[PDB]
Amino acid sequence: TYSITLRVFQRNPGRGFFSIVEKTVFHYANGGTWSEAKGTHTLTMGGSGTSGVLRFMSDKGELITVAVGVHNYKRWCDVVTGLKPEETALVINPQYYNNGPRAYTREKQLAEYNVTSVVGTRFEVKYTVVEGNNLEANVIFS
Amino acid sequence: TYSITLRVFQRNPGRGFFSIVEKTVFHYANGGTWSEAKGTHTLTMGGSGTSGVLRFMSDKGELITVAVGVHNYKRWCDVVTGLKPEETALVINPQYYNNGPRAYTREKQLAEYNVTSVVGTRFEVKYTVVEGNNLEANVIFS
Amino acid sequence: TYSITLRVFQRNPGRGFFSIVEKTVFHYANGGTWSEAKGTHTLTMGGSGTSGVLRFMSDKGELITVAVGVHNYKRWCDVVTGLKPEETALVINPQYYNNGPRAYTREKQLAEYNVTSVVGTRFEVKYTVVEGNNLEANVIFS
Amino acid sequence: TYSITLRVFQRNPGRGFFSIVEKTVFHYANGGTWSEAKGTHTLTMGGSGTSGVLRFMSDKGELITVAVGVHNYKRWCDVVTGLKPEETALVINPQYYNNGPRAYTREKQLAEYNVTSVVGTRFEVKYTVVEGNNLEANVIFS
Numbered sequence: 001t002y003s004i005t006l007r008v009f010q011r012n013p014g015r016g017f018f019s020i021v022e023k024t025v026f027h028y029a030n031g032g033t034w035s036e037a038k039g040t041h042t043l044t045m046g047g048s049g050t051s052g053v054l055r056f057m058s059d060k061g062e063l064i065t066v067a068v069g070v071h072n073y074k075r076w077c078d079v080v081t082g083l084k085p086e087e088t089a090l091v092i093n094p095q096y097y098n099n100g101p102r103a104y105t106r107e108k109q110l111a112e113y114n115v116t117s118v119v120g121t122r123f124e125v126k127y128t129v130v131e132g133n134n135l136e137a138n139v140i141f142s
Numbered sequence: 143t144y145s146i147t148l149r150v151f152q153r154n155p156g157r158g159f160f161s162i163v164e165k166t167v168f169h170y171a172n173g174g175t176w177s178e179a180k181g182t183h184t185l186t187m188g189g190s191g192t193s194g195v196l197r198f199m200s201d202k203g204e205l206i207t208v209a210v211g212v213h214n215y216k217r218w219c220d221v222v223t224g225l226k227p228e229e230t231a232l233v234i235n236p237q238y239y240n241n242g243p244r245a246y247t248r249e250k251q252l253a254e255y256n257v258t259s260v261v262g263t264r265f266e267v268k269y270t271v272v273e274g275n276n277l278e279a280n281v282i283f284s
Numbered sequence: 285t286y287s288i289t290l291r292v293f294q295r296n297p298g299r300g301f302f303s304i305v306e307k308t309v310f311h312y313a314n315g316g317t318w319s320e321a322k323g324t325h326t327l328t329m330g331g332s333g334t335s336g337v338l339r340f341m342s343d344k345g346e347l348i349t350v351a352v353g354v355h356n357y358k359r360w361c362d363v364v365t366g367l368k369p370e371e372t373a374l375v376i377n378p379q380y381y382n383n384g385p386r387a388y389t390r391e392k393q394l395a396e397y398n399v400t401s402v403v404g405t406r407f408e409v410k411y412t413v414v415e416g417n418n419l420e421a422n423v424i425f426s
Numbered sequence: 427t428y429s430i431t432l433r434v435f436q437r438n439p440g441r442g443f444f445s446i447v448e449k450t451v452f453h454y455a456n457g458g459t460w461s462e463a464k465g466t467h468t469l470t471m472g473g474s475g476t477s478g479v480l481r482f483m484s485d486k487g488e489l490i491t492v493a494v495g496v497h498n499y500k501r502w503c504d505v506v507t508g509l510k511p512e513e514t515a516l517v518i519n520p521q522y523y524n525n526g527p528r529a530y531t532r533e534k535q536l537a538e539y540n541v542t543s544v545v546g547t548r549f550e551v552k553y554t555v556v557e558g559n560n561l562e563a564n565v566i567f568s
C-alpha cells in the first residue's frame with residue numbers, strides 16, 4: 001500500500017477560506033480511500049499507479065483541485081485552478097490517465113508544485129516526506 | 143439550484159461503524175458541491191439532472207456507495223453494496239448516465255430504497271422531504 | 285496513559301439528529317485531549333483519575349451529556365439528560381469531583397449505562413473493550 | 427443571542443499543525459453551543475456576558491487556548507499559550523470570571539489580539555465583523 005497524508009495551511013484571509021467539496025479516488029492499483037484524523041487527510045491506495053483528488057471551494061466562490069498519487073513508485077502532485085462549476089473532481093481525476101490532457105503532469109513525478117489562479121490565489125503542494133510508502137505533503141493556500 | 147441534505151443513522155454496532163471515504167459529483171446541471179454542517183451532509187447542485195455519491199467504509203472493511211440526485215425535477219437514490227476496492231465512487235457515479243448499467247435506477251426517481259449486502263448489512267435511504275428544491279433524506283445503516 | 289474511543293450510533297430518526305456542541309477534559313491525571321479520526325472520538329488522558337464530557341444537541345433542541353473516564357484503574361461512564369441551556373459540559377464535568385453531586389456515579393465504575401430522557405430518547409453507553417488502557421465504547425441514541 | 431464565527435488560518439508549517447482538542451462554553455447568559463460548518467466554527471450564545479474556549483494542540487505538542495465571547499455587548503478575545511497538559515480549557519474558561527486572573531483581559535473587549543508563544547508560534551485573533559450580534563473573526567497561527 002501507499003499512503004499520502006496532507007496538512008492544509010491557509011495563509012491569507014484576503015483570499016477567502018477554502019473547504020473540501022469533493023474527494024475522488026481513481027480505480028487503478030485496487031483503488032483507495034480518503035480518511036480524516038486530527039485535522040489531516042490521508043489517501044490510502046492499494047499500490048503504486050493511482051491517485052485521488054480533493055476539490056476545494058472558498059467562501060468567495062473559487063474552485064480548485066489538488067491531485068496526489070504515486071506513479072511508478074514515486075509521488076506526484078498537481079493543482080488545477082480557475083475551474084467552472086461543472087468541472088468537478090469526478091471530471092478532473094480521470095484526465096490524468098488514458099492519455100488524457102493532464103497525464104504529462106502525473107508523469108513528472110513532482111515533489112512540489114506551485115500555481116497562482118487567475119483571481120490571484122497562490123497554491124502550493126510540497127511533499128515533506130518524499131520517498132517510501134508513507135508519504136506526507138503540505139498543501140498551502142495563499 | 144437543488145440541494146439534498148443527508149443525516150446518517152447507524153443502528154447496529156454488530157455491523158461495524160461506517161465512515162465516508164469518497165464523495166463525488168457528476169458534471170451535468172453545472173455540477174455541484176458537498177458540504178458538512180452540524181454532522182449532516184448536503185449536496186448542492188446547479189439544477190435538475192445531476193447527482194453525487196458518498197462511498198462509505200466500515201471498520202470491518204465493508205464498502206458501499208449511496209447515490210442521491212434529481213432527475214427531471216424529482217429526487218432519486220440508490221445504494222450499491224459488495225464493492226471491491228477498485229470500484230470507487232469515481233467508477234460508480236458515471237454508471238448512472240450515458241446509458242450505463244445503473245441508469246434504470248436513477249430513472250425510477252425513488253423516494254426510498256432498501257438493500258441488504260451479502261455480508262448482512264441493511265441499508266436504507268428514505269427521503270423525509272420529497273418535493274421541492276431543498277430535499278432531505280435519512281441514510282440508515284443496520 | 286488511558287484512552288477511550290467512542291463510536292456514536294444514532295438509531296432512530298424520530299428523536300431527531302444529534303451533533304456535538306461541547307467537549308471538556310477534567311484537569312486531574314495531567315489532563316487529556318479529545319481527537320477525531322474516521323468518524324470516531326478518542327479521549328486520551330495522562331493517567332487514571334480523570335474524565336471528559338461530550339455534550340450533544342439534537343436538531344429538536346434536546347441537550348444531553350456523555351461522560352467517560354477512568355477511576356481507580358477502571359472505566360466509568362454516565363449520561364445526563366434533560367439539560368437546560370445553562371448546564372454546559374463545563375458545568376457538568378466538575379460535578380463528578382470534589383464531592384460534587386455526580387461523584388457517586390463515577391465511583392460505580394460502570395461498563396454500561398442506560399437512561400431514557402424526558403423527551404423519550406434512549407441513551408446507552410456500552411464499553412466493548414472494558415479493561416486495560418485502550419478502552420472502547422459504543423454510544424447509542426435510540 | 428450572539429454568535430461568533432471563526433475561520434482558522436494556519437500559515438507556517440514550521441510550527442507544526444494544530445487541531446482542536448477541547449471546546450468549552452461558560453454558563454452565563456443561558457450558555458451556548460459550538461457548531462461546525464464548511465470548515466468553520468461558530469459559538470452561539472444566549473445573550474451578552476458569556477464565552478467559549480477552543481483548545482488546540484499541535485503535532486509538535488504545543489497547547490494553546492483561544493477564548494472568544496461578548497462582554498457588555500462588545501466582543502472580546504484572548505489567546506493563552508505555553509499551557510501545561512493539566513491546564514485544560516475547562517480550567518481556563520472560568521478564569522475569565524468570578525474575579526479570576528484573566529477577567530481583566532475579557533474586560534478589555536478587544537477586537538484583535540496578538541501573542542507569540544515560548545516556542546515561537548505567532549497567534550492572532552482578529553475580528554472582521556466587530557459589531558452587532560453576528561460576529562466574525564479570523565484566528566491565525568503563524
Ligand SMILES: CC(=O)N[C@@H]1[C@@H](O)[C@@H](O)[C@@H](CO)O[C@@H]1O
Nearest residue numbers: 028029048049050070071072073
Ligand atoms: C507501477 C505503476 O505505478 N504503474 C502505473 C499504472 O498503474 C498506471 O497508472 C499507468 C498510467 O499511465 O502508469 C504506471 O504504469
Ligand SMILES: CC(=O)N[C@@H]1[C@@H](O)[C@@H](O)[C@@H](CO)O[C@@H]1O
Nearest residue numbers: 170171190191192212213214215
Ligand atoms: C431536467 C433534467 O433533469 N434533465 C436530465 C439531464 O440533465 C440528464 O441527467 C439526463 C440523463 O439521462 O436526464 C434528464 O434528461
Ligand SMILES: CC(=O)N[C@@H]1[C@@H](O)[C@@H](O)[C@@H](CO)O[C@@H]1O
Nearest residue numbers: 312313332333334354355356357
Ligand atoms: C488512581 C486514581 O484513579 N485516582 C483518582 C483521583 O485521581 C481522583 O479522580 C479521585 C476523585 O475522588 O479518585 C481517585 O482517587
Ligand SMILES: CC(=O)N[C@@H]1[C@@H](O)[C@@H](O)[C@@H](CO)O[C@@H]1O
Nearest residue numbers: 454455474475476496497498499
Ligand atoms: C450584559 C453583560 O454582558 N453582562 C456581563 C455578565 O453576564 C457577566 O459576564 C459579567 C462578568 O463580570 O460581566 C457583565 O456584567
Ligand SMILES: CC(=O)N[C@@H]1[C@@H](O)[C@H](O)[C@@H](CO)O[C@@H]1O
Nearest residue numbers: 078079080081082102105115117
Ligand atoms: C492556471 C492553472 O490552474 N493551470 C493548470 C495547471 O496548474 C495544471 O498543472 C494543468 C494540468 O492539470 O492544468 C492547467 O493548465
Ligand SMILES: CC(=O)N[C@@H]1[C@@H](O)[C@H](O)[C@@H](CO)O[C@@H]1O
Nearest residue numbers: 220221222223224244247257259
Ligand atoms: C446487492 C446490491 O448492492 N445490488 C446493487 C443494487 O442495490 C443497485 O440498485 C444496483 C444498481 O446500481 O446495483 C446492484 O445490483
Ligand SMILES: CC(=O)N[C@@H]1[C@@H](O)[C@H](O)[C@@H](CO)O[C@@H]1O
Nearest residue numbers: 362363364365366386389399401
Ligand atoms: C434522567 C437523567 O438523565 N438522569 C441523570 C442520570 O442519568 C445521571 O446518572 C445522574 C447523575 O449524573 O443525573 C441524573 O439523575
Ligand SMILES: CC(=O)N[C@@H]1[C@@H](O)[C@H](O)[C@@H](CO)O[C@@H]1O
Nearest residue numbers: 504505506507508528531541543
Ligand atoms: C504568552 C502568553 O500566552 N501570555 C498570556 C496572555 O496572552 C493572556 O492574555 C494572559 C491572560 O489570559 O495570560 C498570559 O499572560
